[PDB]
């Protein structure tokens, strides 16, 4: 029912301001919240700020002098500018949408790459270890997701990601499975500490998994654990 499509500069000159859109598509919606999040370099997950149905906005605290997120209602769209870039910022930008009223689904976008040429805060840090592993077919498989501190398990996410995709919504609520994802598939944990099991290795389950995280601001993801298969 909803699509969004990032658009912009692809380069961008230090000191700059960094301008993006997000286009949002198909059914009209009563609630909830349209969120910048980009990727750098490596692949870590950076949660910027979003904007709700009532126009408040959140921002990460690293980024909170720079940045504004701004709509245009009328238009469908939803604006992210970011002020003095530097070569930190270089990442894919992704917009996402997301409705508390309904925790099992999460829309993202395809991603726009943007390449470069204030306020004080705290985060929960989510360790992903390890950050590569290789497992055969058919093998059982268990990734961990390790919380600097507690989170609350309703609010403990996880993604799947393939290369040239944008991170999908596998796990919500530490152990409820998403639309689309096989019921080989489970999660489990609490507190600080939380794990993704795969009961029967496929081919197709190669890929990123990372942990999320928003019992606390600003939210936050894991490293990430990339799965890959064995045998060549
Ligand atoms: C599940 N990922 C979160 C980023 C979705 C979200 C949750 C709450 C909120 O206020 C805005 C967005």
């Known amino acids: 029912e909803v699509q969004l499509q990032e658009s912009g500069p692809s380069l961008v000159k230090p000191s700059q301001t960094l301008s993006l859109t997000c286009s949002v598509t198909?059914?009209?919606?009563?609630?909830?919240?349209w969120s910048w999040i980009r990727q750098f370099p490596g692949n870590k997950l950076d949660y910027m700020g979003y904007?709700?149905?009532?126009?408040?906005?959140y921002y990460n605290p690293s980024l909170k002098s720079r940045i504004s997120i701004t709509r245009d209602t009328s238009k469908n769209q939803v604006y992210l500018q970011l002020k003095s870039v530097s070569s930190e910022d270089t990442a894919t930008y992704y917009c996402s949408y997301f409705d508390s009223d309904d925790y099992a689904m999460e829309y993202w976008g395809q991603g726009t790459s943007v390449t470069v040429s204030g306020g004080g805060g705290s985060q929960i840090v989510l360790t992903q270890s390890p950050a590569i592993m290789s497992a055969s077919p058919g093998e059982k498989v268990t990734l961990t997701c390790s919380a600097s501190s507690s989170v609350s398990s309703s609010h403990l996410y996880w993604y799947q990601q393939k290369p040239g995709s944008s991170p999908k919504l596998w796990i919500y609520s530490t152990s409820n499975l998403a639309s689309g994802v096989p019921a080989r598939f489970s999660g489990s944990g609490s507190g600080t500490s939380y794990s993704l099991t795969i009961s029967s290795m496929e081919a197709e389950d190669a890929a990123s998994y990372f942990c999320h995280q928003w019992s606390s601001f600003p939210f936050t993801f894991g490293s990430g654990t990339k799965l890959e298969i064995k045998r060549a």
């Open positions: 198909g059914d009209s919606v009563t609630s909830g919240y």
């Open positions: 904007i709700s149905y009532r126009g408040s906005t």
